[PDB]
Structure formats: C-alpha cells, structure tokens
Amino acid sequence: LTLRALERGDLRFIHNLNNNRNIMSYWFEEPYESFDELEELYNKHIHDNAERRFVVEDAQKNLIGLVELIEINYIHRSAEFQIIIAPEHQGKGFARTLINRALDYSFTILNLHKIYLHVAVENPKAVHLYEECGFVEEGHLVEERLFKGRYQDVKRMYILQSKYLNRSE
Amino acid sequence: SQLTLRALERGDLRFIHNLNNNRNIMSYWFEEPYESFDELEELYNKHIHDNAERRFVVEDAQKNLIGLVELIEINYIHRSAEFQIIIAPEHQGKGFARTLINRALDYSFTILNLHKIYLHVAVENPKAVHLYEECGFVEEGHLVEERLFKGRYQDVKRMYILQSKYLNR
Amino acid sequence: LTLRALERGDLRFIHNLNNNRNIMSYWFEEPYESFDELEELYNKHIHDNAERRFVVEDAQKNLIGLVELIEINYIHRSAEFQIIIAPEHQGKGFARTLINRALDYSFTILNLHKIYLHVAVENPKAVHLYEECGFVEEGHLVEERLFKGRYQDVKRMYILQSKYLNRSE
Amino acid sequence: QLTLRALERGDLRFIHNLNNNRNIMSYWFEEPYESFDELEELYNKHIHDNAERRFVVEDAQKNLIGLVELIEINYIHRSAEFQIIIAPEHQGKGFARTLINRALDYSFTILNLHKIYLHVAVENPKAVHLYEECGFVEEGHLVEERLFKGRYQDVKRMYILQSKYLNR
Amino acid sequence: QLTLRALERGDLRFIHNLNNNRNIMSYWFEEPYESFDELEELYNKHIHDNAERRFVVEDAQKNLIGLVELIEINYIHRSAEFQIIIAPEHQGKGFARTLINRALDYSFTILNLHKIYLHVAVENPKAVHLYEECGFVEEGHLVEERLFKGRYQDVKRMYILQSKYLNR
Amino acid sequence: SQLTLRALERGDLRFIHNLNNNRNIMSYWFEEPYESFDELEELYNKHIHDNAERRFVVEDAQKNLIGLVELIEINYIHRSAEFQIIIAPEHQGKGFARTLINRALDYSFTILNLHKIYLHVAVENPKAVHLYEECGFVEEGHLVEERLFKGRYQDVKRMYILQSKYLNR
Amino acid sequence: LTLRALERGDLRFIHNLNNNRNIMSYWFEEPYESFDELEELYNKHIHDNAERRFVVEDAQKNLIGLVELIEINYIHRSAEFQIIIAPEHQGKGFARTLINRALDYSFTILNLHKIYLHVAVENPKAVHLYEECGFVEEGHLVEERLFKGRYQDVKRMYILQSKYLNRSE
Amino acid sequence: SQLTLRALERGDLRFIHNLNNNRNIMSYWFEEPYESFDELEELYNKHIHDNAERRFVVEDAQKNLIGLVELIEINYIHRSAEFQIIIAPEHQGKGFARTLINRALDYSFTILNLHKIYLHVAVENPKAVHLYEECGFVEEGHLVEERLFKGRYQDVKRMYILQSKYLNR
Amino acid sequence: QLTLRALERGDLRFIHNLNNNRNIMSYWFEEPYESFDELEELYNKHIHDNAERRFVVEDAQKNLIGLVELIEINYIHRSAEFQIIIAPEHQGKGFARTLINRALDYSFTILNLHKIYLHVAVENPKAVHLYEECGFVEEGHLVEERLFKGRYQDVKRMYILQSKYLNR
Amino acid sequence: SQLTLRALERGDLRFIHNLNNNRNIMSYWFEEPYESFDELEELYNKHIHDNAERRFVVEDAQKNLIGLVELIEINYIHRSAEFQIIIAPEHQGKGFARTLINRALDYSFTILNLHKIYLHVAVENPKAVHLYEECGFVEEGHLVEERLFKGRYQDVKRMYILQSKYLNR
Amino acid sequence: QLTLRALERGDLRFIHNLNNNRNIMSYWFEEPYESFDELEELYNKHIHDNAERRFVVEDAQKNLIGLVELIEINYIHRSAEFQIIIAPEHQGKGFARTLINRALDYSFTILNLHKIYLHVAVENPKAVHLYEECGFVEEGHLVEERLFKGRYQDVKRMYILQSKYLNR
Amino acid sequence: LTLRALERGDLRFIHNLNNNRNIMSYWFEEPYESFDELEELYNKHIHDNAERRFVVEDAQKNLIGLVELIEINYIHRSAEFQIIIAPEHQGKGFARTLINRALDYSFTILNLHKIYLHVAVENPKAVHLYEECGFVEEGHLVEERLFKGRYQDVKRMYILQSKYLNRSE
C-alpha cells in the first residue's frame, strides 16, 4: 500500500466515497454534495494548508481509501485524523498500516506534536482499533455531533509525537 | 425503492431547462429570472456553492430522468425551507410523488437537520392538497391573492411538516 | 406626526430601539448587535430596494418610532410590515395613524398589491389593533420563529391594495 | 405549428443575417453594432440584462421563421415596446397575426405587463391595420420621430392594454 | 433676472426639498430614491452620466426659484424630455414662460438637439396651453401611461422641433 | 444586577488591548495574532461583521469597565461555541464571575439559540474548574498536552453545558 | 462588389495590406507592426465607435480592399475617409463605386454631416479621382505629415451630406 | 513683460469655470463635456497627468487673472498642437493678446519642441484672423461648415505657424 | 523599570531617528528606505506581516530607550534573528543585558521559537562577550558576509536554544 | 536584397530563445531578465504593445532565420534609440551584417523618424568597431568599465549616426 | 557532455518525481507542497520571481540527470545558497564535480554574485570533502539547525567567494 | 551642510527650483509642470528605487539645494548624478562639498560601481568643477539633448568607486 498526495484526478474517488455515508460532506469546512461543487472547492483551497489528504493505492494502483488530516493547527502543532476505506476493501486488514503511515507523516514531515481523532460511542469496534494503534481516550464529548437528526456522543482519542517516535527506544 | 435522488450537476441543466416547457410561469434560479439555456448555465456558474437552494435529480434504475426535488428559501436561522417537486410529464401519473416527497423530507430532516418544511399549493388544485396531507403535511395558512399565475392573482395553501413529527413516525 | 425616510443620522435611534427586544436584530437579513456593525451594513445596502424604513417624528422633531417595509417583492408586489414605537411614546395613540400612513405609501407610491405582517399568537392585543386597521388573518404559522430559545406560533395577517384604496367608495 | 423559443447564443448568426438589408443601424440593448463579433460580445455583455427579451420563431421542421423582440421593458410602469421581424422568405405566409398574439400572451401572462406599445411608419398603412386587427389602437402620431435614409420620419405609436387582452 | 445654473452637489438639498409633497416616487437617472443620503450617492454615481442634465433656477438675489430638467437625452435620435419644477412659493409669479424658453435655447443651441417633448397630465389643461403658447404641439394622447396615487393616468405628449424654434 | 453586557464597539478596543497586559500569551482576533493596538484595529475593521466570534464589554452602573465576555469558534452547523471570560485585574476577586457566566449563557441559549457551550480551563487551576462546575458546567474531557503556555505544553479540562439544562433550570 | 463590416477573420487581410506602404500602421490611433499586436488592438477596440471599417469583397468573395472611417466625431457629425485597394485589383475601376458606397453609409446610416479626406499633394491623380466623386478642396495643409523622414504637404477635401443626398433632386 | 504664464493647478479651476460664462458653447476637458464645477473637478482629477492637453493661467504682476492659454490635440507623433487663447472679458481689449500668443509659441517651440502649431478662427471674425496673421500665422484652409455654433454650422479658417519660422525670426 | 512595548505607528519617528548615523541602508521587512514617508508606507504595507516583530524599549518616565527587533522569523524551522539598538544617550547605562533577556523570554515563551541567532561584527569583541554572558555561543565565522562602508566584513553568528534558556 | 526584415511574432520566440544559447550574458526582455522559454513568452505577452523596444526577424528568400535586429531604449522625447544586431552563428561570417545595419537605419530614420541611433561595442572587439565605422557610425564615447561581462567590468565604445547624415547620403 | 538548461513547465514532472523518497517537506520559493497540482500552481505563481533559479541537468541523449538549484538569491548582499540533486540512477557516475563547477560559473559570471554558500549534514562527510575539493570551505557548524525525521540536526555551512573562483 | 532624504514637504522646494530652468521637468522619467502633477507623481513613485533625491539644508534649516541620483541601475551598479543649487546660494562655495557627500553615499551606502554625469559643452565652467572633484570625460555626445528647440552636444564624465574610496591610501 502507498500513500499519495491528493490530485485533481482523485476527486471522482472522493465523491464516490460519500455515496451512502448519510452525512453532509465538507471540504475545508465548507459543505458540498455535487461533484461540480467539490471541484470548485478544490480549486479554491489547492494551497490551503489547513487540511491535507492522501489517496491510498495498492501495487496495481487500485484506489483503496483516503487519509485525511483536518483542523491542522500550526500554533499548537495539532491535527485531527480521519481514515476512509472503500467498502470493497474494508475487510482485508489495511486500517492499521494506514493509521501508522499517517502518524509517521504527521510526526516526521509535518513535525506535529499531537494527533487526535473522534469516534462515535456507538461504534466501539473503532475505539479498540485505534486503542491498538496507540491512541488513548482523552474525552467523552456529550451530544457533540448530529447524525440522522439526533445528537450523538463522541469519543476523542489522542497520540503524542514523543510516544510514537520513542516507543521502541 | 428503484428511484434515486442525486445532487444536481451541470450536465443536468438541459433537463432543468426542458422541465420548464409548457409550465406557463417564469423560471427562477436562486430568485433570478431566466428563459434561455445560456442564461441558466451562467446563473448556475454564479450560484454553484450558494446554499440558499438545493436541488436533486430523481432517476430510476435505468437512469431515466423522472423529476426534480427543489429545496428553496433554505433559512439556517429558523432552520426552515420550502419544498417543490416537479415530475416530468411522461411520469406524472405513476405514483412516484409520495416516494419522492418522503425522500425529500428524509434529507431535509436527517442531513440538513431542518426544523420545518413548508410548501405552497394552488387552492384550485385540491387533489395536490390532499396528496401532501396524506404524506404528513397540514395546512397552516390560506394566503389570499398571494401569487400571480397567467396575469391573475390566485390564492395558495401553505402547508407544513415539522421535524419532530417525521422523525417520531 | 410625520414619516421621513431613514437617514444615516437616524442609526443611533435604530440602535437604541433594540435595547431590550431580546431578539437578534437584522439589517437586510443580516444580523447585527453593535452600532459599528449597523453603520457598516447601512453603507452596504444604502441603495438596496429590498427594505424601506421611515422614521416617525412629531412637530417638535422628537423621535417617535420606526416604520419598516421588509421582504419587498416587486415580482408579486408584496411587502412585510413592522412598526416599532419607542417605549416612552407607546401609550399615546399613534399606532393606528402610522399603520395607515404606511399603507398609503405602500399602495400609492410603491404601488404594491399586498401588505402582510406577523404577530405572535401570545400577543392578542396586537391582533385586534391590526384587525381594527383592516388586516385579516390568513394564517396561523406553527412553531414559526424562535423566541427565548423556544419556538412560537405566529399569526400572519394581510390587507390588499384594492380594499384599502376603494374602501369608502 | 409556429414556436417561440428564447434566444440563445447559437441564434446570433440568424440575428446578424436578419439585419443584412434593413438600411438602418442595428442595436443590441441600445448599443450600435454591425459585425458578428461586435454582436457576440454585446450578447455576452447583456446576457442577464432584462431590459430586452427576444424569441426566435421556428416552425415544426425547425426552420427559422422570424424574431419577436420586446425592448424598453420598464418594470416600474410595466410597459414594453414590441417589434416583430419575419424573414423575407416567410413574409407572405400570414404568420404575423399568430406571432403578435403569442408575443402579447407572454407579455401579459408571464411578464405581467400592463401596456404594450409599438411604432409603425406612417407610410406603411398595411401594418397599421394588421396591428389594429390584433387589438392595437393609435395613441400618437409622432412628428419627425426617427431617422431613415438620412431623413426624419413620422411614426404612429399604437398600444394595447393588459385589461383588454385578458378577458377572465 | 432669472438665471439657469448647472446643478452642483450643494444644490442636492434643494432637490430633496422639492420632492417633499409630490406624492410620487422620485428618480435620479431612472433610479428610485427618497432619502438625502440615497440621492447624494446616486449623484456621485451619475456625476458624468450625460443621459440627464439639470439646471437650478435662481433670481438676482440668489433665491432658489426652481429646476429645469432634461431627461431621456438620446444623442442618436437627438431628442430629450423636458420637465420644469417651480417651488410652491414662486409658482404664481409668471416665471414659467421664460424658463421654458431658456431651456429650449440650451437644448437647441448648446446640445444641438432635434426634438424636445414633454408629458402633461390630461387633467391640467392650464399647463397644456402654456406649453402651446411656448410653441409645443400635441403629438399623442397616451392612454393609462403613468401611475399616480395608485391609479393609471393618461398623459398628453407635446413636442417642439429645432427647425421651428430656430429661425435664421 | 448592576452589571451590563454591551456589544463590542471600536472605542472599546483600547480596553481590549489593555486587557492583554501581563497575560503571557499571544493575543488573537478571529484566530489572527496581534500585539500592537494598530494591528488590533486593522483586524477589527476586517472582521467587523464576521460572526465566527462575538464579544461583549461588561460594565457597571457607573460605566466602569469590568471585563469581557468572548464567544469564539461559534459553529452554526453544530450550534456550539467556546466561552471565555476575562475580568480586569482590579475586579477579579469581587464575585462578578458567576453573574457574567450566567449572562453569557443566557445570550448563548436564548438569542443565539445555541445547543452547547464548552470551555477550556487549565488543569493547574482547579478553583476555576470548580467555579464553572458550580455554574452548571460538567467535565467532558481531560486534554493531554493540549496547549502551549510559556513554552511548555499543559493539560486542560474541557467542560460543557447544554441548552436543555440551562433552559429547564 | 460588397461592403461588409470587418471581422476578426479579416485581420490577416488588414496586415497584408500594409506590406510595403512604408508608413507606420495605426489601429484607433495606436501604432502596430506585427499581426499579434494588431489582434490585441482589435480585441481592445471591438466596441470603440471612433473608427469603422468595411472589407470589400466581390461575388466570389475575393478580398478587394478596405474602406475606413476614422476620427468619427459625433459632436460635429464628421469623419475622415480612407480607402485601400489591394495591389492586384488596383487597375480595374472599383475606386469610384466604393467611395460612393462609403458616402452612402456615412450619410444614411451614420447620418453624418461632413466627410473629409487627406491626399498627398505629390499625388495629383488621387485629387482628380476624389474631385470626380464630388469632393472639393478646403485646405492645403503645409508640412502636415512625415513620409520617409521628410514633411509633406497634404490636401484636405470634403463633401457634405446635403449635397450628396440632394444632388439629383 | 508684466504678464506671466503658469501651469494650471486645482485652485485655478474656479477661474476656468467662470471663463465659460456667456460663451454659448459646450465646454470640454480633454474632449469630455461638462457644465458644472463638480464635473470639471472630477475630470481634472482624471486627466491630471494626461499630456494630450496643456493649459497655462495668465496673470499680471499683481496676480490678477488675465486669461488662459490652451494647447489641445497635442500630437507627439506629428509634433503638432492646436492653440486656443481665452482672455477674461474685463481684459479683452487692452492689447494683451499678441504677447500671450508669442509666449504660447515660445513654450510650444522651445520646451515642447513641437513642429507646427495651428488654430481655428471663425470666418465671421475677420479681425481675429488678421491679428494672428500679424503674429506669424498663415491660412492653410477654409473649412466649410466645420463647427456647430448656436445650432448652425459655420466655416472656420485654419491657420498655422511652423517651428522653423518662429525660431529663425 | 525598563518596558518592552509592541511598535505602533506613533513610534515610526523614533525608528527614523535611530537610523540617523548608522552609515548603512535601513530596511523594513527587507525593503530599503531612508525617508520617513517611505517608512510610513512600508509600515502600512507590512502591518500584519509576521516575518518581523519589533518592540520599543521605554523607562518608567516613558523615555524612549531603544528598540528590540526580531527579524527573519521562520515559523517552520522555528528560528529568528535578534537585533538590539540602544539610543546613543543610554548606551552606557548597562541596559543591554536586561533587554536581551526580555527579548529571549518573548521569543521562547510567547512565539515558542526553538533557536535565536544573531550576527556580531568581528571587530567588536565587547558585544561578542556580552552575548556570551547572556547565553549565546558562536556557531559560525561568516567570511565577507555583509557590506559596510564599501567593504565586505566578516561576522560572527551566535545562537541560543530554547532548551537552554528554558529550565523547568 | 534577398534578406527581409519582419516584425517579431509569438512564433518567433523559439528563435529568440535559441539565439541566447552560448552568449554568456543574461538575456533581457524590455529590461526584465529571463532564461527559460516560458519566462520569455510570459514577458512577451506583457509587453506585446510596449513601444520602448522594437524587434525584427531577418529571413532570406527561403524563409531561413538569419538573425535579429533590435531597437531598444527607444526614447521618443529625444528621438533616439539603441541598436543591436544578432546574426545566427551559422550565418555570422557571410557578409549579411552591413545590409542589415542599413535596413535597421532605414526603418529607424524613415518610419520611426528618429533623430539619432547609437550602439555599444566592446573595446576588445575592434573589428566590430570598424565595421560600424564603415557603415556611417562615429565614436562619441569610450565608456570605462561600463558593463559586466563574465564577472568583470569592460570598456565599451559608444558610436552614433544621425538622421541628417543617413538621409543626405 | 552534461548540459544545464533553465527549468520549464514541462520539467515539473521531473521535479515531483525527484521528491518521491526524500522524507522531508518539499518547498517551491519557500512555500510547502506535495502534489503535482500544488507544484504547478506554485510554478505559475513564481514564474518571474527571481529569488530562486533552477537548472535541469541532461546528458547528450536528453536523459534527465539531475537538478541544480540556487535559492535565497539575495541581490543586495550578492549571495545565494546552492543545492544539487542527482537522480538515484546517476548518483554513482561522478557527475557532481562538473555540475558544481557549472553552477558556480553561472553564479559568478552570469548572476555576478559575490558569495555562494551551501549546507551539508554533519553525518555525511563524503559530501563535505567533495565540496572542499571544489573550493568550498567551512564557515559554520550550525547547531540544531534543521529538522529531519522529527529530530533537529546540525549542519555545516560551506562557502566560496567570487574572488577565489574567478582568476583573471 | 546636511543631506536629507526627500520628503513630501520638500515638493514645494522642488517645484520652485524649476522656475526658470527653461526645460521640461521630469519625475522618474515622466514630464510635469504643475505642483499637483508633481505631487501625484511623488505618491506614485514613493517606493521606486530607480531614482534617489536628497535635500541640502544648512544649520538653520535653510533649503540650499537638491542632490539627485537618476537612472540608478543595480545590474551594472551605476547611476547618473545631478546637483541643483538654489539661485540665492549659488555663489558661496557649496558645490564641491555636496558632490563629495553624494559620491560618499553612492559608493558606501548604495555600494555603486560607477557614477556619471552630463554637462553641456557650452558650459565649460561646470566641466572644470567636476574635473576638480575627480570626474573624467568619457564621451562627447553629439546632438544629444534638445535645449530651446536646438540640439546640443553634451559631455559625459565619470568617476569609479575604487578610485574614490582608495584615492588617499
């Protein structure tokens, strides 16, 4: 598996990944639905550093998934992490490798201090995946985000740069 | 079940323009009048990411164009919107209306998280009034000489449905 | 009493009229709180025809109140009416005269077809005032607007140009 | 049979050809032009201007019959001036009456205008009585109103009201 | 005695006051307005627009007598519409004839226009015969032309040509 | 009762700038850093009607400047905001805090109609934690090494209060 | 022969007509030499009324020449006339017909009052051509224009609208 | 000798505007019409450094305003210009004209280094023709119905003077 | 006693006067200038530019003591160059040590920078050992680095890290 | 006689760029440096109608590219210009130089009507000095350490030729 | 054999590929980027910016050998930083010496710069002595200068003057 | 005597210095005559480095003269020098000191390589002044500049940085 910076040609893949996520899609904190809306927003934020995205491909260049770093704050050296694996490739064992490649980039190239992510409390499976990748819960946000017209509680988990880089030393 | 709602794209504008044929009323795009296709496309480029209105192309499994679902006057302060549905003449008497109305309500109340959807129906179209009544809408107003149609003012019923009613159904 | 078009020098009066209305103030559908915000919005919409405002003064040029015409639609020739009387001059008997002067302008100078207004159902006193000025209820809007964090029902009342101008003939 | 379709960019060639032998300056939203490239740039400039509205007249086989123009569209006084141009080939086919009525229908039922007026040269009484038969009535005889072939001409202003055209 | 002076920014207050009790919407270069601040910004916007030209009428002691307006100035057909407004105080002093002639002189000798027309309400025959005595002649009786107090009104269009006003 | 909240004006910027004295942290205006007064005023002119943040000057009956109530990260999608309160040093130990916190909550929940207010407090300031707890806030997170203070990362408590709790009180 | 308004496709012909005229070419009073300069100037003045040009073609659409009206003054209703016939078609007898077609347009469509032209004194042949087309000398301009580094005298000839239109009446 | 030419400044525009009184001809500033002082000042700000025209205020030793020397149609390609001189009515019959004409010629031929100055004089003003003839000018044209004056076309003499003649004098 | 205050527009006169006799071109955000009007327009241009940060040094009685400059602020490598200018009147009052420490404190606790460096002329060993006593250490001897009085000069680059200045 | 001068077009820029090969000096376009072809084309689009410089492509009858004639520092105040000529290496010793120099002088003195052409030649290239001397140029200056060439200052001769000399030849 | 050619738009793909496995953020005129589309827009933005100059290194058969970069070009102090990147395929072919000399030749004879410096990681002594053999000399040992793989590194700054490279 | 960079307040002095120089004044190669033209040009080129000017004042702040550096070329490190001493202070002995102060700035602060100046051949006095300040003639430019409508020859004199700085060593 390979992480490649997002290109214009990858926007179709991005649009298709939102097929039945049953939630409003956002591009640099701006909502969109159509492909033409997405392409206009991509042209607008092509140099915006607030968010960073990587397309995950395999040896045969099949589009496996998407790695996103959003809310990139260079003051506090923080960023939020989101990973989306295409439905067809969700049951193969790629999540852990992609989470670690994303953490390596965040902590070695972006030189960030802290990476955090949000997981729905009703999704306990994801909590253990991220716990097994080194993340630890730092918050249980009450009625944080709306899903299907009802407020949900969300867990916030984190991992620090010093731990990730010096874990085996 | 076979019907699908898809966000409007540029290639769908020809369908929009054709839907205006023999409707005997000036067409508007984000409250701006237009008649020609080139006027429509220019207004589409201008409001590509204006969120005051949202439109969805309704297709069947064979990708035949069935109709259009419009959400206009989207007010994010009061969390309300006006709903219009236009079924192509060749598909107008096949019973698609009720399904599309519920799809529109689902998106309005679960993705846009709106509080109230309202719609206006000509008083001289009592069957449309009863169709929306059977889909959950209730009359909240009988607006006198509200709108001009073919050079003469006409009364219209304003009917509403609240998010609380649709979600607890 | 005299109706005078609003001027920049009247913005202080506008700002003071919102002292304890316990609701967000809007200028051409844009929210504001501070005076500097209001003055910037006034410079922005100085030629916008969507709204029209008149300052009510007495013989000694005391600022009595404000007459507002908003949602001015020149397609349907409609407009919404709002009248605000300063607290000190609320118990003197000016409301009726100002409502009629406003209707005269709306129907003779703007040549509008219909004037409507919204009254809180919990404010029955205002309903009878407007009923005594010729307005008639055309709707009981359910949970229309938010006040103090709770949705309210609002009555919509109307008066037509033909009735007002030909009432005594 | 005849159809009225809003003017598109692809119809500008037809507009240009209709001006070939009119012996008077052509105007697009009150701006003079002659070449096709001038017209096209004026079209791009006024694509959203609502002061004028034009319709291409076609038949069942999509032949270009003529053009219906509504100019001087004043939305405060709710008035507009009406002009009709039928291509030389189809001028003697008796299409004018239908196109005048379709133009009035749009003016009074879609644009909801109050008054439609038109100007006819004093020297063409045939057109005068055609418009009279469609409902128009003379309200003025404008003296030396417009210039034609280097000489001022008088024109008849004829009008028809929405109240007359629309019968409940 | 009477003087015609081009309108300046300092005269906008006079313009605003002249609109106090006319019971009709005021327009500046065909844009509606009511407040003084709206007028002033419209003045700054059209300061170089030549579609209209206005003159303040003053007396020897610099009192503001009235206003001469030339609107709809069309430089291709060489025509313009004439309006005159005399302040209520000086309306019965017999100034109108001189101001109409001074306005025509400017129109025909400075702007070199070919035709000046004006519109007079059917219900004021006094003004009709004043303009007739200054040389104007009726060329139209426009039916339900303009709106006044919520009702459509007919107006007389009156004209005078440069050829008539100018005698070598 | 004597204290009053007033929307921020240009003339209040000197007060804002003086409030930054001896706080040992870079000041931000709509997430843009600044130190000098001229930098502040320029950023104020730029964000005069940016609604991502709202500020209120707290005064007493004698119009003495007591402090500042800030609402930042105002998110109208999730209907949430972050709350900061800065009391001038000369008024910091007089018991004004609880009153101002409730005033801020009232405006947040009755005028902005927000769903959730949250705030961040340094873990090494346990008395501030308990003050907000006594005003209705509850801890939803213990964010590890979240913010830089004097060149060293520090943990902060995230505490929240929901609109439903404050309104039904 | 036919007079046709100049189009972009005719610019190559314009450029070729300047091959060996041994004088600086101008487009709306701006000098040019290259084709790319000419095309940029044409895009700049596409709607400028100060100059008007017509391409002269025959029945087989061969490019015969160019008719130019420059210094078009709508205040005095005047314009300067220049005619250029391609070298290959200079000895066939077209000049007179093109001069009269140009005068007809100038006096019937542009409704101009006076047309004038400039002829080099050392070119007496052209003087008699224009004299035979109705032009009369009104001036002998001394050292008016530079040609091959030396000042030349130029004759100015004119024709009025009243004469041309009423000559045969 | 007492008379002085001074480049035009903003404070001299009132003098320019007053000079237009009772001249019975539309005034132009860089070929743009104007009547009011505010129109003049705006056009002055626009052409402050346009070199197509140059104007000089003529004063006496006591700084009384005598007149104006204008150089218009300044053509730097042909090195020519048109000369107009306007003496204030109160100074029009005192013999200043010849001195000012020579001053203007000196500046034109020694500072602007022009090759030819020309001027236009009404044929019905034969005394002005002879004054310029006595100052070195010679007639090169009798332009028929060249200019409109009080609604009627009039003939004008074009007279010239060359740099070689003035310098070798 | 001494105070560091962010630079304001009113302090530009002080900046200009500090350049009077430095015999080298003055720069504002790497743009050269000499006149006060040039400085003021450069100030308006870079008012929000964060590549440089300056502080006016004042005493208790609000006398202008000097200026602390942080230039070449690189937020990716978290580095910046430090310059200090004390007015000739107060140069021998022993203020430099306190101002260097206050500048480092801001650099390492407010801007959270990792490394602060400075350049000192080889020919001034007094300043070299002052900075050494404040914690700086030489990391380079740049050969013919900068131009002074028409001749290239060598400079010592001295640095201090955040890890050293900050002791938990 | 076979050689021809043609105004520079966009398609000739590749020739210009190739002419810069192995000249060991930074290239300039209207006094702006450039190395790459894309830099050249962008600067060409920017100065398409800048008249401070004029360039001509020299071709033979078979349309083979022979060289380039440049006129730079064109000063229309003093009516002067600097002349550079670059012959392609493959054509540099065939005797074309003298013909091209005269062609350039002809255009400079008969079409641009300039008064003086000057050129600079390296003192260490005495044969070029004598070639221009045989074409009419005369030395007016020996400029000491005027220009940098390969990192070292070099003296250059400035030689001139006046319009009066070339025309009376 | 080897050629240095100014960078063109068509060479941006080569630039992007050269960054594939460098494990550090890539910069174009001090702006970070990763994707090709980001690079291309940064190229269009800085096409005329003279703060940096790059040359593509090709062989006789037009194979892409490497890249010569001159960054931090300061035209007042007449200095610039030199970087060279040879594609992995051609790294062991002994091309570096020739490319360093061709880059210096351009820097000192075309740009007429006074000083060229470069930064080399402390941990690569081979490159240090390569540059020493081409004329460079160490002027600094910058402590914790740059970040690599999440850890600060020391770098050697090496310089060469125009006076040394150019011998009359 | 003191050299001070030019400020806006010095423009009056600049304008007065051109009173009777009988030559067109230029500001960054743009001609001007009036003060308002000069002030507009100063605002335009306030940051332009192509020219540099210094006002010469005495101890009592009397305006003595002006030092100008024009044609400042940073490629070749050259600049042209012009010095203007007010008429009242021309016979006191200031020229030499100002020329040397100007050379010191040019060679120590601007670090230029060469300074040159132009002197009219008919002004031999100035030639010896500059020769006594170290300048040497490098050219006798033939008919270089126009004065009073006739071309003049001009001497170009120069001084190099190495000579000036190392003259006494």
Numbering used by the authors:
A (entry chain B), C (entry chain B), G (entry chain B), L (entry chain B): 5 to 173
B (entry chain A), F (entry chain A), H (entry chain A), J (entry chain A): 3 to 171
D (entry chain C), E (entry chain C), I (entry chain C), K (entry chain C): 4 to 171
Give sentences copied directly from the paper behind this entry.
SpeG is an SSAT protein found in a variety of bacteria, including the human pathogen Vibrio cholerae. This protein adopts a dodecameric structure and contains an allosteric site, making it unique compared to other SSATs.
The first construct (R3C1) removes the residues that form a portion of β7 and a portion of the beta-turn of the β6-β7 region of the protein and replaces them with the corresponding residues from hSSAT1 in its linear sequence. Since the N152 residue of VcSpeG is replaced with a positively charged lysine from hSSAT1 and it normally forms an H-bond with R25 of Region 1, it is possible this substitution would repel the interaction between these two regions. Despite crystallizing in a range of crystallography space groups, six structures adopted the apo-conformation of VcSpeG. The R3C1 model showed the secondary structures of this region generally adopted the same conformation as WT. When we examined the residues of this construct compared to the WT protein more closely, the homology models showed substitutions of F149 to arginine and F150 to leucine affect their interactions with Region 1. Additionally, when F150 was replaced by leucine in the model, the T-shaped π-π interaction originally formed between F150 and Y155 in the WT structure was disrupted. However, when we examined the chimera with a four-residue substitution (R3C1), including both of the F149 and N152 residues exchanged with positively charged residues, we saw a much more substantial decrease in activity.
